[PDB]
Design an enzyme around this catalytic site. Structure first.
Site, PDB file in Angstrom:
ATOM      1  N   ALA A 179       0.786  -1.227   0.000  1.00 48.42           N
ATOM      2  CA  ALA A 179       0.000   0.000   0.000  1.00 48.42           C
ATOM      3  C   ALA A 179       0.826   1.289   0.000  1.00 48.42           C
ATOM      4  O   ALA A 179       1.785   1.438   0.755  1.00 48.42           O
ATOM      5  CB  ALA A 179      -0.932  -0.002   1.176  1.00 48.42           C
ATOM      6  N   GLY A 190       2.330   4.859   0.627  1.00 50.20           N
ATOM      7  CA  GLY A 190       2.487   5.618   1.858  1.00 50.20           C
ATOM      8  C   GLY A 190       3.742   5.304   2.651  1.00 50.20           C
ATOM      9  O   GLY A 190       4.722   4.756   2.136  1.00 50.20           O
ATOM     10  N   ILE A 191       3.698   5.654   3.929  1.00 45.70           N
ATOM     11  CA  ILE A 191       4.811   5.429   4.827  1.00 45.70           C
ATOM     12  C   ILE A 191       4.674   4.107   5.577  1.00 45.70           C
ATOM     13  O   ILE A 191       3.805   3.966   6.427  1.00 45.70           O
ATOM     14  CB  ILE A 191       4.943   6.616   5.822  1.00 45.70           C
ATOM     15  N   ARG A 192       5.544   3.149   5.236  1.00 42.50           N
ATOM     16  CA  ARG A 192       5.582   1.812   5.852  1.00 42.50           C
ATOM     17  C   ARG A 192       5.503   1.927   7.370  1.00 42.50           C
ATOM     18  O   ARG A 192       6.119   2.810   7.964  1.00 42.50           O
ATOM     19  CB  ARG A 192       6.880   1.096   5.473  1.00 42.50           C
ATOM     20  N   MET A 232       5.608   0.610  11.580  1.00 41.13           N
ATOM     21  CA  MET A 232       6.424  -0.088  12.566  1.00 41.13           C
ATOM     22  C   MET A 232       5.874  -1.466  12.967  1.00 41.13           C
ATOM     23  O   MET A 232       6.635  -2.328  13.400  1.00 41.13           O
ATOM     24  CB  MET A 232       6.579   0.769  13.841  1.00 41.13           C
ATOM     25  N   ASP A 241     -14.444   0.127   9.914  1.00 47.10           N
ATOM     26  CA  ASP A 241     -14.767  -1.259  10.217  1.00 47.10           C
ATOM     27  C   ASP A 241     -13.689  -2.127   9.583  1.00 47.10           C
ATOM     28  O   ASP A 241     -13.114  -1.749   8.561  1.00 47.10           O
ATOM     29  CB  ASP A 241     -16.129  -1.640   9.624  1.00 47.10           C
TER      30      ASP A 241
HETATM   31  N1  LIG Z   1      -7.300   1.924   5.336  1.00 45.67           N
HETATM   32  C1  LIG Z   1      -6.143   2.239   4.627  1.00 45.67           C
HETATM   33  N2  LIG Z   1      -6.217   2.808   3.397  1.00 45.67           N
HETATM   34  C2  LIG Z   1      -5.109   3.114   2.699  1.00 45.67           C
HETATM   35  N3  LIG Z   1      -3.893   2.874   3.177  1.00 45.67           N
HETATM   36  C3  LIG Z   1      -3.729   2.310   4.391  1.00 45.67           C
HETATM   37  C4  LIG Z   1      -4.852   1.968   5.176  1.00 45.67           C
HETATM   38  N4  LIG Z   1      -4.380   1.429   6.334  1.00 45.67           N
HETATM   39  C5  LIG Z   1      -3.079   1.414   6.303  1.00 45.67           C
HETATM   40  N5  LIG Z   1      -2.648   1.947   5.122  1.00 45.67           N
HETATM   41  C6  LIG Z   1      -1.243   2.101   4.713  1.00 45.67           C
HETATM   42  O1  LIG Z   1      -0.300   1.564   5.680  1.00 45.67           O
HETATM   43  C7  LIG Z   1       0.261   2.665   6.425  1.00 45.67           C
HETATM   44  C8  LIG Z   1      -0.289   2.670   7.791  1.00 45.67           C
HETATM   45  O2  LIG Z   1       0.246   1.529   8.374  1.00 45.67           O
HETATM   46  P1  LIG Z   1      -0.185   1.601   9.910  1.00 45.67           P
HETATM   47  O3  LIG Z   1      -0.141   2.975  10.498  1.00 45.67           O
HETATM   48  O4  LIG Z   1      -1.721   1.142  10.024  1.00 45.67           O
HETATM   49  O5  LIG Z   1       0.835   0.412  10.669  1.00 45.67           O
HETATM   50  P2  LIG Z   1       0.631   0.802  12.138  1.00 45.67           P
HETATM   51  O6  LIG Z   1      -0.842   1.036  12.358  1.00 45.67           O
HETATM   52  O7  LIG Z   1       1.439   2.208  12.134  1.00 45.67           O
HETATM   53  O8  LIG Z   1       1.293   0.050  13.339  1.00 45.67           O
HETATM   54  P3  LIG Z   1       0.676   0.908  14.694  1.00 45.67           P
HETATM   55  O9  LIG Z   1      -0.769   0.694  14.818  1.00 45.67           O
HETATM   56  O10 LIG Z   1       1.372   0.299  15.993  1.00 45.67           O
HETATM   57  O11 LIG Z   1       1.006   2.464  14.619  1.00 45.67           O
HETATM   58  C9  LIG Z   1      -0.075   3.951   5.712  1.00 45.67           C
HETATM   59  O12 LIG Z   1       1.132   4.537   5.265  1.00 45.67           O
HETATM   60  C10 LIG Z   1      -0.992   3.599   4.587  1.00 45.67           C
HETATM   61  O13 LIG Z   1      -0.391   3.946   3.334  1.00 45.67           O
END
Ligand SMILES: Nc1ncnc2c1ncn2[C@@H]1O[C@H](COP(=O)(O)OP(=O)(O)OP(=O)(O)O)[C@@H](O)[C@H]1O
Ligand SMILES: Nc1ncnc2c1ncn2[C@@H]1O[C@H](COP(=O)(O)O)[C@@H](O)[C@H]1O
Ligand SMILES: [Mg+2]
Length: 566
Positions: free
Chosen positions: A314, A316-318, A320, A370
């Site tokens: 996806a 965006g920013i990978r 953690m 959801d």
């Molecule tokens: N519903 C979504 N729609 C589009 N992109 C998403 C969505 N959810 C996650 N992403 C992508 O993945 C990244 C977000 O990853 P995410 O923040 O959910 O990992 P994480 O949640 O940071 O781990 P943590 O919950 O401990 O912070 C975003 O950069 C986005 O590009």
């Protein structure tokens, strides 16, 4: 032999009958909960209703177990059961949900593996409904033969709500102006109404859902019935727009509580209004979450067989902790907990999983999306992009098993794909940027007012919808609001004698992040300065603890009658 194959088939079906029965016995209580403004109950109902289905799939599997145990674990025997169960369907009004239930049971039995189309209803077996005549109405028609004031007085005087109206004529006239300024006196008399028999309850509101039949074509007609601080019924605004309707039934709001003895019927009527919703989305809107999971997997299979694109990480920013991928033209993303998290992190996969569960059954308030948890989701190697296959093998090796041409991911979440708000704020400008920051600030505000504190409020954890709404999606960052210690003065930096402890939050350090880009900083100070004041936050947790439950409007505030019309 045979007799057993039959008992099973029938105990599974008796199971669905009972769970749906219980499901709507719960739903029918919505009116009373709302009538006596028992707001805390309204929320517990949302949690009990969500567990019902799994509870029964549980009971049924236990029975299935005692009833035999030896054969339950036998794929040859269950092939026959499916056979019989299928012959019981041509009758049942809710056969589709009956199939899901069978699948759910099948899955518990085989721990979600070896799910062939011949072993469970991944597809349906039944001919497509394409409705005839509902056994009983489900919606009434209203013609204005003296209508509008008469038509409305008649419908408002039809709600079984047992509370006093704090000036109907008032509200009734507001509705007339809207229609009038929207349709023009001429057509307003050429147009009529068709309102659903049941009210759609959600939070502190009781929704009326009908269709505005204009000579132009049919249109949405929704009236949010709210109740005053001292039990006064009043109609707050009226929405006759498709986009508006799409938000009211948006994926980021808790499901509606509407009595529906025949779901498929209700779903089909709904298509007319909000026609952008897919089948699963419509089911999900009215509460059949588990069944919508079945439909979601189908829409997934359809889209997949019809596209020559591969799964890619996806945009965006990978993150953690999660590894999230998506199909180029698909409107959803897959999220898997990573084997190990970035050094800066000190939480368990269990905790992450708990948060997702936390928000699932939470008053999502229109700001949290959801999600669907899937066990043993199967993917075809030839479909995974090479760049992604190595990421998975390297970051989630523990959660994937090889099967030659295809791999199996043990656990993962599926949710609406939005555009990362950090990307939006870099693409948008002017008014569109103001709308995003406002929308962002209000997201934090509403999450907060519902006892949810985003863990990390950085833009990258929010998403922008088709409608430009900001929705939070980084769930394991979260914690309840009544569980954080807000502070006034931030710790020194010199970018520790100034002892800070777990749970401490300094709203003034927010300035540093949420306001570093000169483009947006000013916009915050103008529309959301309160978010930097620890006093603001503490006030919020006070009302929470005091048991207060803030109001949420599934629409722009400037559309409320009491706002535009005086
Ligand atoms: N519903 C979504 N729609 C589009 N992109 C998403 C969505 N959810 C996650 N992403 C992508 O993945 C990244 C977000 O990853 P995410 O923040 O959910 O990992 P994480 O949640 O940071 O781990 P943590 O919950 O401990 O912070 C975003 O950069 C986005 O590009
Ligand atoms: N691993 C899976 N792969 C494909 N579909 C699944 C999977 N797990 C569950 N389902 C579907 O979702 C519904 C079951 O949800 P559940 O009861 O939570 O397992 C069933 O109707 C199945 O078709
Ligand atoms: Mg993140």
């Amino acid at each position: 032999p045979r007799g057993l194959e039959l008992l099973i088939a029938q105990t599974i079906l008796q199971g669905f009958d009972a769970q749906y029965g219980r499901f709507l016995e719960v739903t029918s209580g919505a009116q009373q909960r709302f009538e006596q403004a028992d707001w805390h109950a309204v929320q517990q109902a949302m949690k009990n209703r969500i567990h019902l289905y799994d509870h029964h799939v549980g009971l049924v599997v236990e029975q299935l177990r005692c009833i035999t145990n030896g054969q339950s674990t036998d794929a040859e025997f269950l092939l026959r059961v499916k056979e019989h169960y299928t012959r019981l369907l041509p009758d049942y009004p809710r056969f589709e949900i009956a199939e899901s239930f069978f699948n759910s049971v099948y899955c518990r039995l085989f721990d979600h593996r070896s799910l062939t189309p011949e072993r469970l209803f991944i597809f349906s077996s039944q001919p497509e409904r394409r409705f005839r005549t509902i056994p009983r109405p489900l919606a009434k028609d209203f013609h204005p033969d003296h209508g509008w004031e008469s038509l409305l007085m008649r419908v408002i005087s039809d709600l079984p709500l047992r509370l006093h109206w704090q000036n109907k004529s008032r509200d009734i006239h507001y509705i007339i102006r809207h229609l009038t300024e929207t349709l023009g006196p001429e057509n307003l008399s050429k147009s009529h109404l068709q309102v659903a028999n049941e009210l759609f309850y959600r939070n502190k509101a009781a929704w009326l859902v009908g269709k505005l039949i204009t000579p132009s074509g049919t249109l949405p007609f929704l009236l949010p019935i709210h109740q005053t601080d001292d039990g006064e019924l009043f109609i707050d605004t009226c929405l006759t727009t498709t986009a508006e309707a799409s938000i009211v039934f948006g994926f980021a709001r808790s499901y509606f509580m509407v009595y529906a003895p025949l779901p498929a019927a209700l779903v089909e009527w709904l298509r007319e209004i909000l026609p952008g919703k897919t089948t699963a989305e419509l089911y999900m809107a009215i509460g059949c979450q588990k069944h919508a999971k079945t439909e979601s997997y189908r829409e997934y299979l359809v889209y997949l067989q019809g596209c020559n694109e591969q799964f890619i990480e996806a945009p965006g920013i990978r993150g953690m902790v999660m590894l999230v991928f998506t199909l180029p033209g698909f409107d959803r993303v897959f999220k898997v907990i990573k084997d190990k998290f970035a050094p800066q992190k000190e939480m368990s996969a269990a905790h992450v999983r708990a948060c997702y569960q936390l928000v699932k059954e939470h008053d999502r308030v229109g700001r949290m999306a959801d999600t669907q948890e899937f066990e043993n989701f199967v993917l075809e190697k030839r479909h995974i992009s090479p760049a992604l296959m190595e990421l998975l093998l390297q970051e989630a090796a523990e959660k994937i098993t090889d099967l030659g041409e295809q791999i199996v991911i043990r656990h993962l979440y599926i949710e609406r794909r939005m555009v990362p708000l950090n990307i939006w704020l870099e693409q948008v400008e002017g008014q569109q940027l103001r709308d995003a920051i406002e929308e962002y600030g209000n997201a934090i505000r509403q999450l907060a007012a519902a006892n949810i504190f985003p863990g990390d409020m950085l833009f990258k954890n929010f998403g922008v919808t088709r409608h430009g709404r900001v929705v939070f999606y980084d769930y394991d960052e979260i914690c309840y609001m009544t569980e954080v210690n807000f502070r006034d003065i931030p710790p020194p930096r010199y970018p520790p004698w100034y002892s800070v402890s777990p749970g401490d939050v300094f709203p003034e350090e927010f300035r540093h992040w949420l306001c570093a880009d000169p483009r947006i900083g000013p916009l915050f100070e103008e529309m959301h300065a309160d978010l930097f004041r620890a006093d603001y936050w503490r006030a919020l947790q006070n009302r929470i603890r005091e048991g207060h439950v803030e109001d949420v409007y599934a629409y722009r505030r400037r559309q409320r009658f009491s706002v535009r019309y005086g």
